[PDB]
Amino acid sequence: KTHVQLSLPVLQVRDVLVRGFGDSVEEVLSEARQHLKDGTCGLVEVEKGVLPQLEQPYVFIKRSDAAPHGHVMVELVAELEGIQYGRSGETLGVLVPHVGEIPVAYRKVLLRK
């Protein structure tokens, strides 16, 4: 399938134990896609002071369209020193590994895979 319905656990930035997916734009996108497939991916909602508490490169989910079955359609865009790799809509949040942190919510998304 080109798209996969996922429910992403929304984590508070100060709870997150593993604050990024790796060390290159290509690695963080690879790792983000593997974690999304394995159900081991969390979402941090971006507000003032969140991103400086996380590790670059960042992986964003961005709205790719204006929402089947409650699931907002999204795609991945990475960012490193102010340059983005990809072009998409509004940021739903930043992706991080999930290693058992208690979420505050779930975000239903349709991921272009």
Curated annotation (Swiss-Prot):
<comment type="function">
    <text>Inhibits host translation by associating with the open head conformation of the 40S subunit. The C-terminus binds to and obstructs ribosomal mRNA entry tunnel. Thereby inhibits antiviral response triggered by innate immunity or interferons. The nsp1-40S ribosome complex further induces an endonucleolytic cleavage near the 5'UTR of host mRNAs, targeting them for degradation. This inhibits the integrated stress response (ISR) in the infected cell by preventing EIF2S1/eIF2-alpha phosphorylation upstream of stress granule formation and depletes host G3BP1.</text>
</comment>
<feature type="region of interest" description="Disordered">
    <location>
        <begin position="1"/>
        <end position="113"/>
    </location>
</feature>
<protein>
    <recommendedName>
        <fullName>Host translation inhibitor nsp1</fullName>
    </recommendedName>
</protein>
<feature type="domain" description="CoV Nsp1 globular">
    <location>
        <begin position="2"/>
        <end position="113"/>
    </location>
</feature>
